[PDB]
Design a protein around this ligand. Structure first.
Ligand SMILES: COc1ccc(/N=C2/NC(=O)/C(=C/c3ccc(OC)c(O)c3)S2)cc1
Length: 328
């Protein structure tokens, strides 16, 4: 069978914290008053919720209200517990309140408001310095939640709110996040297609925080190469082919061989043979101002098949890529 795997860092965080830290099924929600918040406009509708701009009339404060669609109470308490465990963390969205929505019959989460510009406009104008700056700010958030025993599992541009005027970043949408427990087998149906790690795409369930580092690598490649998304698969199978055409098939086989994993035989007719490419081939006159040797080396150390070989968030913050970023 498959070879087990554990994270190389923060392995035992949850087994040394009290059961109440991670046993989200037993969490008792503390309810606020739903009448404190007036909905202003709908911002978005997802698979599991709808998001609204709102105002706290007992505050005059702008907030964001996320009203949950029905899903098993386990996953609602999971997201609530995770947001409360992480509240106050560097660049973590702050959960201000929780209420019962009378119409939906489901909880509604109240968040701090971030005056963000959508990434499709923002990524068109981010400079080399901006990308390094915001990548460092994301790394602060990930190392924090990783150090707190939590993996986000849905890192993507949509889940990174940026108020570019105030240089403020928040990592949002913790609805897929989960507590890391060594040896635990997790659902591989997480993250968006373009940001799924190879571990998900080969159905290896004993993954860890390093999944988020793959997703971050995918974001980085889209930004510095100005190709969003970078690995643009048509489905989950073609997604791994897209990755293999860049990272090569020999290291893909080394990866699945290390973990005693087999590919789905439907890859037989589609995967092919590919050498590993030099990242410089994606450089051209329209993105070269975003690319440096340090950028390519950093990206190369995030986008590894072997989840055990990717930089940790901590190690990533040590990379020369960030030497130019002013640290507060
Ligand atoms: C496109 O449909 C959806 C549906 C649900 C979503 N899920 C969230 N999960 C969070 O935590 C969110 C927090 C948030 C969003 C925007 C903000 O400012 C504009 C802000 O301050 C906080 S959104 C996202 C998009």
């Amino acid at each position: 069978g498959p070879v087990p795997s554990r994270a190389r860092v923060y392995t035992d965080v949850n087994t040394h914290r009290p059961r109440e830290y991670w046993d989200y099924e037993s969490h008792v929600v503390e309810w606020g008053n739903q009448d404190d918040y007036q909905l202003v406009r709908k911002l978005g509708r997802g698979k599991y919720s709808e998001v609204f701009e709102a105002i706290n009339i007992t505050n005059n404060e702008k907030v964001v209200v996320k009203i949950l669609k029905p899903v098993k109470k386990k996953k609602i308490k999971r997201e609530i517990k995770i947001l409360e465990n992480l509240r106050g963390g560097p660049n973590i969205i702050t959960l201000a309140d929780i209420v019962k929505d009378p119409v939906s019959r489901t909880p509604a989460l109240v968040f701090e408001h971030v005056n963000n510009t959508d990434f499709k406009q923002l990524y068109q104008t981010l400079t080399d310095y901006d990308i390094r700056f915001y990548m460092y700010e994301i790394l602060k958030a990930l190392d924090y939640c990783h150090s707190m025993g939590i993996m986000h599992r849905d890192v993507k541009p949509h889940n990174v709110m940026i108020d570019h005027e105030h240089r403020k970043l928040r990592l949002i949408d913790w609805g897929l996040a989960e507590f890391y427990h060594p040896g635990q087998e997790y659902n591989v149906r997480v993250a968006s297609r373009y940001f799924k790690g190879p571990e998900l795409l080969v159905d290896y369930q004993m993954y860890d925080y390093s999944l988020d580092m793959w997703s971050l690598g995918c974001m980085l490649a889209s930004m510095i190469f100005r190709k969003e998304p970078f690995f643009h698969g048509h489905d989950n199978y073609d997604q791994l082919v897209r990755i293999a055409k860049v990272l090569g098939t020999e290291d893909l086989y080394d990866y699945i061989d290390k973990y005693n994993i087999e590919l789905d035989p439907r890859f037989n007719d589609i995967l092919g043979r590919h050498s590993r490419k030099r990242w410089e081939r994606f450089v051209h006159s329209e993105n070269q101002h975003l690319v440096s040797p340090e950028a390519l080396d950093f990206l190369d150390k995030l986008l590894r098949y072997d989840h055990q070989s990717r930089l940790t968030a901590r190690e990533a913050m040590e990379h020369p890529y960030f030497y130019t970023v002013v640290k507060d």
